[PDB]
Amino acid sequence: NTPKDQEIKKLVDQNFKPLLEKYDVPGMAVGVIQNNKKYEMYYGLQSVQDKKAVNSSTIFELGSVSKLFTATAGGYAKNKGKISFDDTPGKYWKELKNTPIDQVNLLQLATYTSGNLALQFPDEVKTDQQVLTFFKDWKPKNSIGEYRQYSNPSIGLFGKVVALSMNKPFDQVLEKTIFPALGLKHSYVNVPKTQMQNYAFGYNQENQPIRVNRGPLDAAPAYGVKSTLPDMLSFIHANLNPQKYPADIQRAINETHQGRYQVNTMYQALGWEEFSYPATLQTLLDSNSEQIVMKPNKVTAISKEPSVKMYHKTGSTNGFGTYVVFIPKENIGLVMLTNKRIPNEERIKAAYAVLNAIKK
Ligand SMILES: *[B@@]([O])(OP([O])([O])=O)[C]([C][C])[N]S(=O)(=O)[C]C1=[C][C]=[C]C(C([O])=O)=[C]1
């Protein structure tokens, strides 16, 4: 009939390719891994003005999908005995001792339940001293641990503490320890001059070329990672097959898969969002609703510990969109990278359509 690689390509053409015209997206990379076979599909241009095609070397900004690597780094440090998730940040960043934030433990930072951390650092918070001041001036609002409010400073502080516990800067933790352990060869916190020719332009909603100029250094654990489609497929492979990796990074990956609490049908793991599988489309869309992403929500203890589960994460920057999803017992995952934002719901819907139509 039709070879499997062509069937997958046809499904990506049917569900992802129309998004390029619908949202005026210059370039897109979509990868599927099924049963340890990788399928890569590249569309469009990484630079419109250079007429340079998206390809396996194209580097994209991951946005909030960066939090998955921070989560993995925390799991690595935990299982090396360098941190406990019950520790507080003042144990490692001593200037935070005797401050309100030092009542919040590392797990609560990593899963957004400190009770009073907003979505972004304030624009004025740019230097290391302003970040220290920001956290020193933090006072609790809600009871610690009771409410989830998605927050880049929350996981930024987590990543900074993880890096302190390993005695290296966070960029070095990823680029010298975690990325190599996962087998990634073109993933970066700082893209080197030798790779600039492969770093896609991002494109804003007027289709003007832009790129993340970021904020403070301690925001990098929240959204500072750049990667290629092959590298993100390797990362999905690692999450699908942790048993194939050395003990330290295997235990780190498994740590990121552990659900910690629920908000309705979402399980909050470390970095990853987790769902009982099969998941309804609406369950996956609800995880990205304004109510969940933008408002505080009371957390509840896990009741059903799902045996059969799936995980996903969206990420965006001003000029890039990302979506990653994987389903362990179906041995399958998908990554989408674009150099223009498109609505999260469209990313989720298109991936749902593809993954559910691929023949087992
Ligand atoms: B993350 O990407 O978002 P989700 O909703 O998990 O998909 C993150 C959190 C909202 N998005 S962000 O705050 O917009 C990342 C960001 C922050 C500051 C500056 C920039 C940029 O592009 O310059 C991006």
Side-chain angles (χ1 to χ4, degrees), residues 2-6 8-9 11-20 22-123 125-127 129-184 186-192 194-212 215-247 249-250 252-289 291-359:
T2 305
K4 175 54 91 43
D5 60 353
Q6 275 182 67
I8 291 169
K9 163 67 175 164
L11 282 170
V12 174
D13 279 358
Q14 281 165 339
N15 291 286
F16 281 90
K17 186 177 184 183
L19 296 175
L20 282 102
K22 186 174 182 178
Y23 295 101
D24 208 358
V25 180
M28 183 172 304
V30 185
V32 172
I33 178 162
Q34 176 184 45
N35 299 314
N36 300 140
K37 302 198 145 43
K38 294 172 183 174
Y39 307 85
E40 289 158 33
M41 284 132 309
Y42 301 100
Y43 302 92
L45 309 174
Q46 70 165 68
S47 167
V48 174
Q49 62 199 77
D50 291 301
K51 295 249 86 156
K52 180 131 163 81
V54 178
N55 66 98
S56 57
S57 292
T58 302
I59 297 160
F60 294 82
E61 304 181 355
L62 300 185
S64 289
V65 165
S66 301
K67 293 170 178 76
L68 304 180
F69 295 103
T70 305
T72 306
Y76 182 92
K78 189 214 145 153
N79 285 284
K80 293 277 164 153
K82 306 293 209 177
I83 60 172
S84 180
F85 288 161
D86 301 304
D87 291 347
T88 69
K91 178 167 195 320
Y92 306 93
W93 194 2
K94 314 294 218 283
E95 298 91 288
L96 290 188
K97 266 152 198 333
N98 203 26
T99 68
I101 191 77
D102 191 43
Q103 304 290 120
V104 181
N105 71 43
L106 297 193
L107 184 61
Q108 287 161 343
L109 286 174
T111 59
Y112 323 112
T113 61
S114 72
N116 194 31
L117 281 178
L119 177 55
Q120 309 281 1
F121 280 111
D123 305 287
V125 174
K126 295 198 271 173
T127 70
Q129 180 72 3
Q130 286 162 321
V131 176
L132 163 62
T133 282
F134 174 81
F135 284 116
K136 275 181 145 253
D137 287 5
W138 183 88
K139 317 214 181 343
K141 212 63 82 193
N142 303 332
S143 325
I144 298 164
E146 181 179 14
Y147 290 85
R148 177 185 190 275
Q149 192 154 76
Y150 191 46
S151 166
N152 282 330
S154 195
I155 189 149
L157 182 53
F158 176 78
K160 178 181 192 91
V161 166
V162 168
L164 287 170
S165 81
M166 332 210 72
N167 205 40
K168 308 143 29 193
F170 179 80
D171 71 293
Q172 283 309 296
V173 166
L174 292 195
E175 285 177 354
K176 306 289 231 292
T177 303
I178 296 298
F179 293 159
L182 297 162
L184 318 180
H186 296 283
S187 299
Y188 308 95
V189 180
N190 303 294
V191 177
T194 46
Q195 289 287 328
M196 281 321 279
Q197 75 267 18
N198 290 325
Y199 190 174
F201 275 130
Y203 288 88
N204 65 18
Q205 300 302 118
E206 294 79 38
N207 282 61
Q208 299 166 338
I210 54 167
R211 270 209 278 261
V212 81
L217 209 38
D218 298 334
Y223 57 77
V225 178
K226 297 97 196 177
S227 192
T228 64
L229 184 72
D231 268 21
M232 305 281 325
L233 281 178
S234 296
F235 182 59
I236 295 294
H237 180 266
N239 277 270
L240 283 162
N241 308 272
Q243 83 282 346
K244 309 198 181 233
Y245 289 75
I249 199 74
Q250 178 187 178
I253 296 168
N254 289 322
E255 199 72 59
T256 72
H257 294 180
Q258 197 189 132
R260 310 289 168 161
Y261 60 75
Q262 306 180 231
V263 181
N264 316 125
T265 51
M266 208 162 64
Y267 299 82
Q268 181 68 66
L270 294 175
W272 293 103
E273 307 161 356
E274 173 185 15
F275 312 87
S276 173
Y277 182 80
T280 64
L281 178 57
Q282 193 56 52
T283 287
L284 303 177
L285 297 176
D286 276 357
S287 76
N288 278 53
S289 65
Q291 177 69 48
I292 299 302
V293 179
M294 293 304 190
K295 300 297 239 305
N297 295 280
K298 189 161 293 166
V299 307
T300 55
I302 288 172
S303 169
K304 285 183 302 304
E305 178 77 53
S307 211
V308 187
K309 41 207 163 133
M310 66 172 294
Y311 302 84
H312 81 190
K313 189 69 192 81
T314 56
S316 308
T317 63
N318 285 329
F320 287 86
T322 308
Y323 181 60
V324 291
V325 56
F326 72 98
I327 308 165
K329 316 247 172 233
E330 301 290 296
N331 305 114
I332 196 169
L334 180 151
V335 176
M336 188 212 70
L337 312 166
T338 58
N339 64 354
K340 189 180 172 189
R341 284 177 272 120
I342 67 177
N344 287 327
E345 286 217 342
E346 298 266 32
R347 314 174 197 181
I348 293 165
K349 281 178 202 213
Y352 187 83
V354 170
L355 288 186
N356 285 311
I358 292 178
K359 294 178 200 154

